Design a protein around this ligand. Sequence first.
Ligand code: NA
Length: 95
Amino acid sequence: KIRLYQFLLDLLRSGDMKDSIWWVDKDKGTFQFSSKHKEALAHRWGIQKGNRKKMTYQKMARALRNYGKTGEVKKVKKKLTYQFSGEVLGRGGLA
DNA sequence: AATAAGCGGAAGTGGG
DNA sequence: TCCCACTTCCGCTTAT
Ligand code: NA
Protein backbone atom coordinates (compact mmCIF):
# COMPACT_ATOMS: atom_id res chain seq x y z
CA LYS A 1 0.00 0.00 0.00
CA ILE A 2 1.16 3.49 -0.92
CA ARG A 3 2.40 5.71 1.89
CA LEU A 4 0.54 8.89 2.79
CA TYR A 5 3.35 11.23 1.73
CA GLN A 6 3.49 9.51 -1.67
CA PHE A 7 -0.29 9.74 -2.10
CA LEU A 8 -0.04 13.50 -1.54
CA LEU A 9 2.97 13.96 -3.82
CA ASP A 10 1.22 12.00 -6.57
CA LEU A 11 -1.93 14.16 -6.21
CA LEU A 12 0.15 17.32 -6.54
CA ARG A 13 1.76 15.88 -9.68
CA SER A 14 -1.53 14.89 -11.33
CA GLY A 15 -3.53 17.97 -10.33
CA ASP A 16 -6.63 15.78 -9.99
CA MET A 17 -7.74 17.54 -6.75
CA LYS A 18 -6.30 20.99 -7.39
CA ASP A 19 -9.13 22.63 -5.43
CA SER A 20 -8.17 20.59 -2.34
CA ILE A 21 -4.34 20.78 -2.36
CA TRP A 22 -1.74 22.91 -4.14
CA TRP A 23 1.91 23.82 -4.17
CA VAL A 24 2.92 27.04 -2.44
CA ASP A 25 6.58 26.90 -3.50
CA LYS A 26 7.15 23.72 -5.45
CA ASP A 27 10.94 24.17 -5.57
CA LYS A 28 10.98 24.14 -1.75
CA GLY A 29 8.34 21.42 -1.55
CA THR A 30 5.80 23.54 0.37
CA PHE A 31 2.13 22.70 -0.15
CA GLN A 32 -1.19 23.65 1.37
CA PHE A 33 -4.66 22.20 1.79
CA SER A 34 -7.97 23.95 1.21
CA SER A 35 -9.94 24.78 4.35
CA LYS A 36 -13.25 24.07 2.62
CA HIS A 37 -12.23 21.19 0.30
CA LYS A 38 -9.67 19.16 2.27
CA GLU A 39 -12.23 16.67 3.53
CA ALA A 40 -12.87 15.31 0.02
CA LEU A 41 -9.14 14.61 -0.28
CA ALA A 42 -9.08 12.91 3.13
CA HIS A 43 -12.01 10.73 2.07
CA ARG A 44 -10.05 9.65 -1.00
CA TRP A 45 -7.06 8.65 1.15
CA GLY A 46 -9.22 6.43 3.36
CA ILE A 47 -10.85 4.77 0.38
CA GLN A 48 -7.47 4.16 -1.27
CA LYS A 49 -6.31 2.49 1.95
CA GLY A 50 -9.51 0.48 2.48
CA ASN A 51 -9.69 1.56 6.12
CA ARG A 52 -12.63 0.47 8.26
CA LYS A 53 -13.86 3.99 9.07
CA LYS A 54 -14.35 7.08 6.92
CA MET A 55 -11.12 9.07 6.88
CA THR A 56 -11.19 12.69 8.06
CA TYR A 57 -8.72 15.49 7.58
CA GLN A 58 -8.05 15.44 11.32
CA LYS A 59 -6.98 11.78 11.24
CA MET A 60 -4.94 12.34 8.08
CA ALA A 61 -3.16 15.30 9.69
CA ARG A 62 -2.51 13.17 12.78
CA ALA A 63 -0.68 10.73 10.54
CA LEU A 64 1.21 13.61 8.88
CA ARG A 65 2.41 14.75 12.29
CA ASN A 66 4.33 11.49 12.71
CA TYR A 67 6.54 12.35 9.73
CA GLY A 68 7.94 15.42 11.53
CA LYS A 69 10.56 13.42 13.44
CA THR A 70 11.77 11.30 10.52
CA GLY A 71 11.55 14.30 8.18
CA GLU A 72 9.47 13.26 5.15
CA VAL A 73 6.90 16.00 5.81
CA LYS A 74 7.15 18.90 8.25
CA LYS A 75 4.45 21.33 9.31
CA VAL A 76 5.13 24.93 8.30
CA LYS A 77 4.02 27.92 10.34
CA LYS A 78 0.93 28.68 8.23
CA LYS A 79 -2.48 27.07 8.48
CA LEU A 80 -2.85 23.78 6.64
CA THR A 81 0.69 24.09 5.18
CA TYR A 82 3.43 21.44 5.05
CA GLN A 83 6.80 20.82 3.39
CA PHE A 84 8.22 17.65 1.83
CA SER A 85 11.88 16.82 2.39
CA GLY A 86 14.39 17.07 -0.43
CA GLU A 87 14.72 13.29 -0.30
CA VAL A 88 10.99 12.80 -0.91
CA LEU A 89 10.97 15.36 -3.75
CA GLY A 90 14.04 14.05 -5.53
CA ARG A 91 13.24 10.36 -5.28
CA GLY A 92 9.67 11.14 -6.32
CA GLY A 93 10.58 12.90 -9.55
CA LEU A 94 13.18 10.23 -10.28
CA ALA A 95 10.71 7.39 -9.66
C1' DA B 1 -20.38 31.17 22.08
C1' DA B 2 -19.46 29.07 17.12
C1' DT B 3 -16.20 27.53 14.27
C1' DA B 4 -11.78 25.91 13.18
C1' DA B 5 -7.35 24.43 13.90
C1' DG B 6 -3.39 22.87 16.50
C1' DC B 7 -0.96 19.46 19.93
C1' DG B 8 -0.06 15.05 20.76
C1' DG B 9 -0.50 10.75 24.13
C1' DA B 10 -2.13 6.34 23.92
C1' DA B 11 -4.43 2.34 22.37
C1' DG B 12 -5.88 -0.37 18.16
C1' DT B 13 -4.98 -2.38 13.34
C1' DG B 14 -1.88 -4.06 9.00
C1' DG B 15 1.31 -6.49 7.16
C1' DG B 16 5.16 -8.27 7.57
C1' DT C 1 7.80 -11.28 18.99
C1' DC C 2 7.74 -7.06 17.81
C1' DC C 3 8.37 -3.31 14.51
C1' DC C 4 5.84 -0.83 10.26
C1' DA C 5 2.91 2.69 9.04
C1' DC C 6 -0.57 4.38 10.14
C1' DT C 7 -5.73 4.69 12.41
C1' DT C 8 -8.70 5.80 15.89
C1' DC C 9 -9.97 7.79 20.08
C1' DC C 10 -9.64 11.25 23.40
C1' DG C 11 -8.57 15.42 26.24
C1' DC C 12 -6.49 19.71 26.03
C1' DT C 13 -5.04 24.36 23.77
C1' DT C 14 -5.04 28.35 20.59
C1' DA C 15 -7.13 31.49 17.25
C1' DT C 16 -5.59 37.15 18.10
NA1 NA D 1 -6.83 31.73 12.34
